[PDB]
Amino acid sequence: EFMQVSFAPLCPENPLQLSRAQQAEMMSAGLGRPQDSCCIDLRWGFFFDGTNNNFHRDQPKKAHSNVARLYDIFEADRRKPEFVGRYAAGVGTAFKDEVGDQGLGIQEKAGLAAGWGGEARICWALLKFLDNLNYYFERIDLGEALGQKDPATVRRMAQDMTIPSMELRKIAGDETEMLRQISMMASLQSLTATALNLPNHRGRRAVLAERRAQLRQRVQTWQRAQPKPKLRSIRVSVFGFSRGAAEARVFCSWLKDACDGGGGELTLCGIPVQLDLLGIFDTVASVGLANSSRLWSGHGGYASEDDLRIAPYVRRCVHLVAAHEVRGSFPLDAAAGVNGEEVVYPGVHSDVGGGYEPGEQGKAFIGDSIDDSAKLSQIALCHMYREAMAAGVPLNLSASRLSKETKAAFKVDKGLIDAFNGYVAATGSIKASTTVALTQAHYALYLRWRRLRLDDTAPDGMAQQPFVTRARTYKAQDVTDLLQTNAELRQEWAALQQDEKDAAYSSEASVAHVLRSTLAPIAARDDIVALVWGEKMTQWREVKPAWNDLSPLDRRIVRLHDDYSHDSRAWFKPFGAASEEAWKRQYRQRMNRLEAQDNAWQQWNRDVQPVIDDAVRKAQKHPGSFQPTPEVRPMPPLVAGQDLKDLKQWRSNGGVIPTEQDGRESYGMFGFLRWRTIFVPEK
Numbered sequence: 001e002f003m004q005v006s007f008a009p010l011c012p013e014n015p016l017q018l019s020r021a022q023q024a025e026m027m028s029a030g031l032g033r034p035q036d037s038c039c040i041d042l043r044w045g046f047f048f049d050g051t052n053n054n055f056h057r058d059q060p061k062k063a064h065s066n067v068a069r070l071y072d073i074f075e076a077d078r079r080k081p082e083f084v085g086r087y088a089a090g091v092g093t094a095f096k097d098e099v100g101d102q103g104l105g106i107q108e109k110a111g112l113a114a115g116w117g118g119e120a121r122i123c124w125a126l127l128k129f130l131d132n133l134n135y136y137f138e139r140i141d142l143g144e145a146l147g148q149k150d151p152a153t154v155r156r157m158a159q160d161m162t163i164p165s166m167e168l169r170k171i172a173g174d175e176t177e178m179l180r181q182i183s184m185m186a187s188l189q190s191l192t193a194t195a196l197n198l199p200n201h202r203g204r205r206a207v208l209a210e211r212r213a214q215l216r217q218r219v220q221t222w223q224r225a226q227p228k229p230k231l232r233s234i235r236v237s238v239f240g241f242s243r244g245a246a247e248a249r250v251f252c253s254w255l256k257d258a259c260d261g262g263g264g265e266l267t268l269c270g271i272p273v274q275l276d277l278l279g280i281f282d283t284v285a286s287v288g289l290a291n292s293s294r295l296w297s298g299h300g301g302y303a304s305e306d307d308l309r310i311a312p313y314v315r316r317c318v319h320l321v322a323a324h325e326v327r328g329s330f331p332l333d334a335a336a337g338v339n340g341e342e343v344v345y346p347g348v349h350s351d352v353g354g355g356y357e358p359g360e361q362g363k364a365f366i367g368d369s370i371d372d373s374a375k376l377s378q379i380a381l382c383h384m385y386r387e388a389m390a391a392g393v394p395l396n397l398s399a400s401r402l403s404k405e406t407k408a409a410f411k412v413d414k415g416l417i418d419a420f421n422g423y424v425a426a427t428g429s430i431k432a433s434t435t436v437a438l439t440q441a442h443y444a445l446y447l448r449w450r451r452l453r454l455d456d457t458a459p460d461g462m463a464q465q466p467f468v469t470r471a472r473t474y475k476a477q478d479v480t481d482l483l484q485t486n487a488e489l490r491q492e493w494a495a496l497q498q499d500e501k502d503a504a505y506s507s508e509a510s511v512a513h514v515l516r517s518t519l520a521p522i523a524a525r526d527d528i529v530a531l532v533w534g535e536k537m538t539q540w541r542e543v544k545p546a547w548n549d550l551s552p553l554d555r556r557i558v559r560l561h562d563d564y565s566h567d568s569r570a571w572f573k574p575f576g577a578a579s580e581e582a583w584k585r586q587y588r589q590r591m592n593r594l595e596a597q598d599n600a601w602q603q604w605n606r607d608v609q610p611v612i613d614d615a616v617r618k619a620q621k622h623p624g625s626f627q628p629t630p631e632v633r634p635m636p637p638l639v640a641g642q643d644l645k646d647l648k649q650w651r652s653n654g655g656v657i658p659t660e661q662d663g664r665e666s667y668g669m670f671g672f673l674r675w676r677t678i679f680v681p682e683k
Contacts, residue, residue, distance in 0.1 A: 001337075001338055001339045002336070002337070002338075002339065003310075003317065003319070003335055003336045003337070003338065003339075003340050003341065003342045004340070004341050004342070005341075005342050005343075005344075005432075005433060005434055005435050005438060006341065006342075006343055006344070006438075007343070007344050007345075007424065007427065007428075007430070007438060007442075008320075008343055008344065008345045008346065008379070008380075008383070008420075008424060009343075009383075009424070010421050010424055010425075011379050011382070011383075011412075011417045011420050011421055013417070015378075015379065015382035015383075015385075015386075015412050015417070016382060016385060016386070016397070016410060017386075018386055018389055018390060019386070021390075022386055022387075022389065022390035023390075025390040025391070026389050026390050026391075026392060029235075029276065029390070029391060029392025030235070030392055031043075031389075031392045031393075031394060035229055038228065038229060038230050039229055039230045039231070039232035040082055040229040040230070040231060040232060041082070041232050041233050041234075041235055042082045042083075042084075042132070042133070042136060042231065042233070042234045042235065042271075043082065043083045043084075043235045043237075043392065043393065043394050044083075044084050044085070044086075044129070044132050044234065044235070044236050044237070045070075045071070045074050045084075045085040045086070045236075045237045045238070045239065045393060045394075046085075046086050046088070046125050046128070046129075046236070046237070046238045046239070046248070046251065047067050047068070047070065047071040047074075047085065047086065047087045047088065047238075047239045047240070047244075048067065048088045048090075048121060048122075048125070048238075048239070048240035048241075048244035048245070048247040048248045048251070049065055049067045049068055049087070049088065049089055049090035049093075049240075049241060049244045050065055050067065050090050050240075050241035050242030050243060050244045050245070050281075050350075050353050050355065051090055051091055051092055051111075051112060051115070051242045051243045051244075051284070052090055052091075052092045052093060052112055052355075053065040053067065053068065053089075053090035053093070053241065053242070053244070053353075053354075053355050054089050054090055054093035054094065054103070055068035055071065055072070055087060055089065057093060057094070058355070059072075059405070059409075061357045062357060062358055062372040062409070063355055063356060063357040064354070064355070064409070065090075065241055065350070065353055065354040065355040066241060066281060066352075066353055066354035066355075066377060066380060066381040066384060067239050067240060067241045067244060067281070067353065067354070068087070068354075069354065069381055069409045069410065070239055070279075070381070070384065070385065070388065070395060071085055071087045071239075072402075072406050072409065073395045073396060073397055073399070073402065073406065073407075073410070074393070074394065074395055074396075075394040075395070075396045075399065076399075076401065077396075077399065077401070078139075080394075081135060081136050081139060082136060083394045084132045084135060084136075086125060086128040086132075088121040088122075088124060088125055088244070088247070089101075089103075089121070090111075090242070090243070090244055091111035091112065091115050091116065091117045091118050091121070091243050091244075092108050092109075092111035092112035092117075093108070093111070095117065095120075095121065095124075096151075097150070097151070098121075098124050098150055098151070098154075099117070099120040099121065099123075099124050099150065099151055099154045099158070099161065100120075100151035100154070100155065100161060101117045101120065106165060106168045106169050106172055107168065108578075109172035109578065110168045110171045110172040113171070113172050113176075113177050113180075113574065114171050114172065114177075114180070114286075114287060114288060114289065114300075115243050115246070115285070115286060115287035115288065115301065115303065116160055116163070116168065116171060116172075116301075117160060118160070118243055118246065118247045118250075118287060118301065118302055118303070119158045119159060119160045119161075119199050119301060119302040120154050120157075120158040120160050120161050121247055122158075122247050122250055122251045122254060122302060123154045123157040123158045123204055124150060124154055125251055126157075126204070126208060126251070126254060126255070126257065126258045127142075127143060127150060127153060127154070127157075127207075127208075127211065128141075129236075129255070129258045129268075130142055130208070130211050130212055130215050130258060130268075131143060131144075133215060133219060133234075133268060133269065133271075134215055134218060134219075136231075137218065137219065137222045138218070138222075142211065142214065142215055142218075143211075146214060153207060153211075156203055156207050157200060157203055157204040157207045157208075158199070158200060158203075158204070159197050159198060159199055159200045159301075160197065160301065160302075162200075163195075163197060167195065171289065174575060175520065175521050176192075176289070177574055177575075178519050178520065178521050178522075178575075179191060179192060179521055179522075180286075180289060181328055181329065181665065181666075181669065181670070182519065182521075182522060182528070182532060182669070183290075183296055184286070184296070184297070184298055184328060184329075184331070184677070185328055185532060185535060185669050185670065186528075186531045186532050186535050187295055187297075188528070188531065189290075189294065189296075190289065190290050190296070191521070191522075191525075191528070194289040194290045195289070196288075196290060196291065196292065196300070197288060197300075197301055198292075198301070199301065199302050204254070204257055205257045208257050208258050209261075212258065212260075212268075212269075215269060216269050219269040220269070231271045232271075232272075233271065233272045233273070233274060234268055234271050234272065234273045234274070235274055235276050235392060236255070236273060236274065236275045236276065237275075237276050237277040237278075237279065237388065237391060237392075237393045238251060238252055238275070238277070238278050238279070239278075239279045239280070239384070239388075240279075240280050240281070240283075241280070241281040241282065241352075241353030241354070241355075242281070242282060242283075242284050242330075242349065242353055243284055243285065243286070243287070245280035245281060245282065245283035245284070245319075245353075246283055246284065246285040246287065246302075246303045246308060246333065247302070248278065248280055249278070249280065249283065249307070249308050249309075249310060249311075249335075250302050250303060250304075250307040250308065252275060252278060252310070252311040252313075252314055253306075253307040253308075253309070253311045254307070255273075255275070255311070259273055265313075266313060274313070274315060275311070275313050275314045275315055276315055276316065276391045276392055276393070277315070277316050277317075277318065277387065277388060277391035277393060278310065278314045278316070278317040278318070278340075279317075279318045279384050279387060279388060280317070280318070280319050280320075280335065281319075281320050281321075281352050281353035281354075281380065281384070282320065282321050282322045282325065282330075282332065282349050282352050282353055283308075283319065283321075283332065283333040283334075283335065284298075284330045284331065284332065284333065284349070285298045285299055285303040285308065285331075285333055286298035286329055286330065286331065287299070287300045287301040287302065287303040288300020288301040288303070291304065293305075297331075297679060298331060299679075305679075305681075305682065308333055308681075309337060309681055309682075310335050310336065310337050310338045310340075311338075312337070312338065314338045314340075315338075315339065316338070316339050316340045316387075316391060317335055317338050317339070317340035317341075318340050318341050318343070318383075318384065318387045319334075319335040319340070319341070319342045319343070320343050320345050320352050320380050320383060320384065321334075321342060321343070321344055321345065321352065321435065321439065322345060322347055322348050322349050322351060322352040322353075323344045323345060323346055323347070323438070323439050323442035323443060323446075324346060324347055324348050324351075324442065324443055324446045324561075324565060325347075325348045325349045325568060325676055326348075326443065326569065326670075326672060326674065326675075326676045327349075327568055327569055327572055327665060327670065328665050328669065328670035328677070329572070329574065329665065330349055330568075330676075331676065331677035331678065331679060332435075332439075332676060332677070332678040332679070333678075333679050334435050334436075334678055334679065334680045334681060335681070336680070336681045336683070337681060337683075342435050343383070344435060344438045344439055344442065345379070345380050346376070346420070346423055346442065346560055346564075346565055347376050347377070347564070347565040347566065348565065348566050348567070348568035348569075349568050350377060350566065350568065351376045351377050351380075351564075351565050351566055352377060352380045353377065353380075354375075354377040354380075354381060355377070356375060356377065356566055358370045358371060358372040358374070358375050359470075359474040359475075360471075360474065360475065360478055360566070360571075361467065361471050361474075361478050361481070361482060361566050361567060361570070361571075362466070362467035362468060362469070362470030362471035362472075362474060362478070362563075363375070363376070363467065363563065363564055363565070363566055364376075364564075365470055365563070366413055366415060368470075370474070371413060372408070372409065372411070373408075373411040373412055373413040373416070374413040374415060374416045374564075375416070376416065376420070376560075376564040376565055376566070378410075378411075378412045378413075378416065379412070379416070379417070379420050381410070382410070382412060385410070397410060416564060419556075419559055419560055419563065419564055420560070420564070422556035422559065422560070423556055423557060423559075423560040425556065426554035426555075426556035426557050427442065427445065427554075427557065430442070434680075435678065435680070436678050436680065439676060439678065440675055443543075443546075443675065443676065444543070444546035444549075445546075445553065445557055446561065447543060447546045447547050447672065447673075448546060448547070448549055448551075448553050449553060449557065449558060449561045450489060450547075450672060451547055451550075452553060452558070453465070453486070454486065454489065454490060454493075456483065456486055456487070461486075462482065462483065462486045463483055463486070465562055466562070466563075467562050467563055468482060468483070476659050477580050477659045477660065478571070479659075480659035480660070480661060481567070481570040481571045482567060482570050484570075484661055484662065485567060485569060485570035485664065488664065488667050488671070489667070489671070489672055491514075491667065492667040492668075492671045492672065492673055493547075493673065494510070495510035495511050495514060495667075495668070496510075496511065496536075496537070496540045496673060498510040499511050499512075499533075499537060500537065500540065500541075503537075505530040505533050505534060507526055507529075509533060511533050511536055511537070511668045512529050512530075512533055512668075514666065514667065514668030515529050515532055515533065515666065515668040515669060516529060517668075518575075518666035518668060518669075519532075519666060519668075519669070532668075532669055536668060536669060536674075539673065539674035539675065540673050540674070542674070542675055543673050543674060543675065544673075547673065569664060569665070569670075569671075569672065570664075572664060572665070573660065573662075573663030573664055574663070574664075574665065575662075575663045575664070575665075576660050576662065576663020576664075577660060577663070580660070583657075583660045584657050587657045587658070588655075588657070590646075591646070591647065591650045591655075594639055594643055594644075594646070594647040594650075595647065597636065597637060597639050598639045598647060600636040601635070601636045601637070601638055601639065604633065604635055604636050607632075607633065608632045608633070608635075611630050611632055612629075612630075612632075615627055615629055615630055
């Protein structure tokens with residue numbers, strides 16, 4: 001039983017069409033068998049969205065993820081209560097009636113920065129697991145039938161919902177986030193005192209055991225009253241993206257807590273439970289601040305190494321991973337130990353899990369029109385759809401309840417199919433056998449694309465390409481992201497070419513200056529700067545051969561990166577404003593303040609000017625008075641420096657808000673000239 005590694009297969013001409021083998025698998029899964037016989041199989045899907053992915057918030061802009069899209073088409077038919085799908089919002093977004101996560105304020109920042117709220121979402125889905133069986137019998141969830149609101153129940157189950165707001169403030173702070181990145185990058189134990197905030201394992205099990213006892217009495221009552229049809233089995237499938245894939249894995253490990261009292265094969269109220277498919281997109285944990293180990297590795301809180309291991313009763317795991325994701329905040333957690341496939345896909349994190357809005361960064365165009373069907377992540381979506389159908393998951397694209405918009409989310413433009421398959425064909429000779437080697441080989445080709453597009457005065461520069469022209473028509477901030485990030489890559493390379501001349505660390509190294517300038521908590525700790533510097537130079541030497549490879553790149557590879565894949569380092573601004581809307585709000589607030597401060601000074605000037613003129617005319621009339629100057633009211637503070645320049649421009653141009661120019665991960669520590677960090681399971 002093992003995870004076979006490969007690159008993405010060619011996308012079929014109809015990506016929703018099952019292969020002959022997959023159509024056989026679907027039939028043997030039981031989907032389609034009848035209730036005419038004595039028995040029934042319940043089929044339950046659990047869908048955990050990724051960081052800052054929220055289905056109802058993001059579907060209107062067609063930016064809902066591949067997890068949300070598959071959930072949307074899971075059967076929700078009042079005539080089929082045996083099929084139940086449940087959706088957990090991504091961390092950093094609202095999940096309020098479910099767990100009490102408001103998705104604003106410090107709760108939002110802690111969820112985005114550190115995965116806070118993931119434990120609570122797993123606990124909620126474990127309650128839903130019990131609710132699903134009550135719903136079969138009674139058409140109402142069990143907590144609702146008991147008058148028990150889910151947030152209060154989850155708070156008895158989940159440590160993260162008890163963390164005090166002042167502690168959440170610490171977890172989310174800017175400087176704390178710099179320290180987490182340094183700890184991740186340099187394998188450094190925390191320099192500051194931190195809290196572990198481990199899961200409330202005992203409370204979670206205790207709550208599930210009492211909830212399960214309430215469930216068992218009802219199930220036994222209804223089975224006695226009406227034993228037909230017999231409940232033959234419960235078939236579970238679990239899907240996740242990003243931190244939702246870390247949650248999905250830990251949910252599979254903790255599913256034992258919701259099933260009948262331990263001892264052999266999983267059952268619920270005597271009914272066999274089987275886990276037919278774990279379908280996960282690019283697993284990223286990066287949770288918490290520390291754990292009980294020497295190396296935190298992003299494996300804090302619920303996301304321990306032990307529980308991230310694919311649970312042994314997972315019958316099939318399909319893990320689609322992003323070949324070209326390289327952000328330091330998004331290390332990959334590889335999956336092994338069960339039957340299935342780990343398949344490397346082109347693009348960055350949300351080119352595989354979904355979630356870009358069509359048109360962002362000038363991608364997902366058909367001619368000059370924005371079109372969701374041309375989004376790269378549509379290919380991986382259909383791959384997971386075919387695997388879910390083959391595993392017996394009751395996704396129903398034909399259901400009459402479905403919206404036009406819901407069904408259009410599974411459309412795939414033939415131009416994207418051709419560009420995707422051209423990429424696969426151009427790289428078919430690579431043939432690496434592990435996920436680390438396969439991703440590094442495809443990232444090496446990406447680096448050669450970046451070098452091709454590096455000189456933004458030249459015809460082959462990124463700035464001169466059609467996708468940047470399209471980005472300009474879509475959103476000014478996207479162009480700034482793209483081109484500022486290319487400028488930062490020129491700086492990254494120049495700093496490394498300078499610093500590689502001397503293998504020994506110096507305080508005057510270029511990269512050292514970058515680190516001190518961008519990482520305030522360690523700017524006075526030259527020894528820590530030296531440690532980060534040493535790892536950065538090691539990473540450069542790893543990728544230098546690819547970056548320096550000036551052999552022509554296959555045209556098919558260039559086209560995919562120009563027109564389909566996104567640049568996730570470019571837009572990700574953990575040290576900028578919380579969002580573009582927040583950036584704009586803060587600029588308007590700053591200008592409003594500067595206007596008030598200037599209107600206060602100008603009004604002082606007009607009150608004082610007559611007094612100063614009057615003292616002049618008098619000294620002219622009596623040049624001998626020692627006319628000492630008159631005292632006036634205290635002068636309000638002067639708008640000066642950059643503040644005055646911005647205010648002047650703001651008045652002149654009528655209120656144009658400049659785009660946000662920086663805020664990305666430091667290129668002195670992460671940047672493009674590195675390999676993505678990938679944790680490969682213990683064996």
